[PDB]
Paper text:
The crystal structures and inhibitor complexes of two industrially important ω-[name] enzymes from Pseudomonas aeruginosa and [name] have been determined in order to understand the differences in their substrate specificity. The two enzymes share 30% sequence identity and use the same amino acceptor, pyruvate; however, the Pseudomonas enzyme shows activity towards the amino donor β-alanine, whilst the Chromobacterium enzyme does not. Both enzymes show activity towards S-α-methylbenzylamine (MBA), with the Chromobacterium enzyme having a broader substrate range. It appears that the different rigidity of the protein scaffold contributes to the substrate specificity observed for the two ω-­aminotransferases.
We also present the crystal structure of [name] Am:PyAT in complex with the inhibitor gabaculine. In comparison, the crystal structure of the [name] gabaculine complex shows significant structural rearrangements from the structures of both the apo and holo forms of the enzyme. The C. violaceum Am:PyAT–mCPP complex was refined with partial occupancies of 0.7 and 0.6 in subunits A and B, respectively. The loop CV Ala57–Cys61 in chain A of the [name] Am:PyAT–mCPP complex was built in two alternative conformations. The major conformation of this loop in chain A (occupancy of 0.7) folds differently, with the positions of CV Leu59 and CV Trp60 inverted at the bottom of the substrate pocket. The mCPP aromatic ring is rotated by approximately 15° between the two subunits of the [name] Am:PyAT–mCPP complex. The carboxyl group of gabaculine forms a salt bridge with the side chain of CV Arg416 in the [name] enzyme structure. The aromatic ring of mCPP is positioned in a hydrophobic pocket formed by residues CV Trp60, CV Tyr153, CV Ala231, CV Ile262, CV Leu59 and CV His318 from the adjacent subunit. The mCPP complex with the phosphate group bound in the same place is almost as open as the apoenzyme structure. In the inhibitor-bound structure the enzyme is conformationally relaxed in a state between the apoenzyme and holoenzyme structures.
Residue numbers in the entry:
A (entry chain A), B (entry chain B): 33 to 459
Write the structure that this text describes.
Amino acid sequence: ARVMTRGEGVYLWDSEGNKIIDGMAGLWCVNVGYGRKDFAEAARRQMEELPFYNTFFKTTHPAVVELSSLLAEVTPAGFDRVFYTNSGSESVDTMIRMVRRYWDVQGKPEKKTLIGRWNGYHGSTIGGASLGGMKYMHEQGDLPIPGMAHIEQPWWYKHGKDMTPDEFGVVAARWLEEKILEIGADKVAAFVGEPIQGAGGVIVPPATYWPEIERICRKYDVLLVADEVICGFGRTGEWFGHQHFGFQPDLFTAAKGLSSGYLPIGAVFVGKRVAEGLIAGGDFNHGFTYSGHPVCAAVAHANVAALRDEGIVQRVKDDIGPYMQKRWRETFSRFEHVDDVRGVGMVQAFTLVKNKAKRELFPDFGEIGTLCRDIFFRNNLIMRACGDHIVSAPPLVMTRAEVDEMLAVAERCLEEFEQTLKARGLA
Amino acid sequence: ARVMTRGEGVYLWDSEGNKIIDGMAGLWCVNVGYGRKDFAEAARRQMEELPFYNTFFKTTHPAVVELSSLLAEVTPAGFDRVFYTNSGSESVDTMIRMVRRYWDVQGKPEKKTLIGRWNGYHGSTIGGASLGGMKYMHEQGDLPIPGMAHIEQPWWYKHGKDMTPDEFGVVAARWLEEKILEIGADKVAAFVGEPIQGAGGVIVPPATYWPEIERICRKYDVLLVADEVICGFGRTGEWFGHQHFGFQPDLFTAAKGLSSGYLPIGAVFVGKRVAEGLIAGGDFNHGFTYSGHPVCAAVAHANVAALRDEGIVQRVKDDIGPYMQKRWRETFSRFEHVDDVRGVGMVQAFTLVKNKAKRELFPDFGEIGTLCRDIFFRNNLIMRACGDHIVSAPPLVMTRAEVDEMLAVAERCLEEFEQTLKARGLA
Ligand SMILES: Cc1ncc(COP(=O)(O)O)c(CNc2cccc(C(=O)O)c2)c1O
Ligand SMILES: Cc1ncc(COP(=O)(O)O)c(CNc2cccc(C(=O)O)c2)c1O
């Protein structure tokens, strides 16, 4: 069929010469777009010159030292300890072990349960798939493992009932309290959440949600962990998604955001309280000192430098983010089977619905999303279909003109979509 | 104070100008040695030119297609389905989930327990740490998780009593049968082992061990899994360690040996029975090659091509392997506190012992190993201490002269070690 032949900026090309507008590469964290020659050079040099680690060497690799130094400058107050891995899935798994070790060290070994959310996603390790709330992943491996619990997701469109979003955000956060009390606070180690659920369909919680979650976590002496694997490194306009929603996690996980997707890498960023805890047990100290594939760290360093020095993150907050959000809602809000148009910064979405009046979803959630996605692709546009949610997360460097080009095509596709719907009486 | 400044061939350099022999090949993984400029070029080109999706519409990324095509040529017959990951740890975790999903699809809901070995090592995830048998690891994330069991390792020097190695291989393999009947066969999904235990100290099992493990696995309808993360890609003289020992696994896992450590990557090679069983449910399907990274696949491709086309693996079997093994046994067999001199291909080891007569180990296993290791480093030689086992696995490209050079230095270090023992009355 059609193979990929080239990537540059926000586009990729196929073997037939088609230019494909990549409206989703940020879900794989390609935040600065394709074709960065300087990143390629950063990798080339490190691979030619240096070893890939070995030991005894009282030192941390110079590529890693530099990356760590730079990250301290761009992360929020209190994150000055970073543990490197090879992926977001590994970062999640390491985080689970850290959270449990922290409580062990505090002399509370029974505090082992982590609480996630249905439709949350935290990667594909046994630990991560257990903490995530995708039912199809739980079946593959008799998951979740012990010390994993789940609460319903803050999806107002489905569960918001007769409530305003804001009233719902309180109710949905209180589900965490209910679960903690059910399990017992002294068996609960942490609550873990993506600031905006990514793979679950860009579920943007109400403004009252995260503050209520945080309040509840502190009330019960439970750690708060953000999974920033999608939302970090400028996706919401802030450097990290938790900054946008105004909560303060005790740890947070990131992945290819570090490298804009150019090479595999992940990290766990550990706040002061937990860091002091772990080091006191002498734990994770070899990881903190020797973690990080130096080639990937070299690319990650060039990337984070670029995001800062080129003003890419600031440009999402001030310029392209507001432009995108306005243009997104302008384009999609009018369609008959489009509802819950949403987004922050450079992540945005809507849901294909049976009936906007009744807030009624299509049956066999996903079938209609697939149809819309298929139309997009026939028209040389990629966006992600998550059930009947259509989601977009383009490179952060996307211009105002590229935004319009993308939305012009998407608009044409929705017009076709609305017609195809009626034409088979699914409307 | 010193830092790494260069790697080339079998050598490393530090900031002081010191030339160091890398007898440990990074982390047993740098099989082609350092300084491959063609590898760096392969990464540069992919990073400059292409997107990073593993799949595009009906096709796979060209770099991945290429790697899989080449892998099919060098893998044992029947292993065409490969699932890519970012590390050996992720490969192990994916294997565990695959093993369990397979029995689910087969309608055997009880059949979920994986059996590993004490002193076995399968990575650092919750899943891999649980399947591994490192007692210090059994309480970082609350471990082992359920459906994990362990048998004793086939370590003749310690457990062999008054048996020949061949008699002991049968006894040590039958511990698996004893364990299966203790648990109940209906509950046991797989046995997993490194053909030779790596991090555990290059524990080479008797020739009788693997054939007997395999008979037992087939007798109870238990899957047989090889962890080739250290033994893979030519380390034993064969492409994979299971080929050397003459067993036929249903799946096997591989890590960065695939790329000689130049970039992070791993794989699960899935045999026909399990692949078909997973297809028969539609499980680990839509998103198979889709966990790894295509830049890493391009490097892995150049590496596997180099191992085949430059005759590196064949040279281990026919030339440098026999030489290393012969010369290793000449060099070390004579020392008063060195015993169990062993190895195959380009992995080899010996154990530091209190008394060769009684076969008595030093107390506080590890203390003496560290002492000997520090001597090596002071002498610009990297060899690994696992407890009181000393281990070596240099790049496979090491010349006969490089072999003697390494052994010349090692011999001098053992002379010094032997003096140090008496000069402390620890002889
Ligand atoms: C929130 C979150 N956490 C952890 C992971 C695991 O990261 P790695 O993939 O680096 O192991 C993820 C996965 N991140 C991810 C990557 C690509 C696509 C999509 C999508 O659903 O479109 C999501 C994720 O979305
Ligand atoms: C047998 C085995 N299985 C899985 C893993 C995990 O692979 P990754 O590390 O690629 O995730 C390993 C780890 N392999 C490994 C790596 C680095 C050092 C050492 C050492 O003990 O010197 C061993 C291993 O030795």
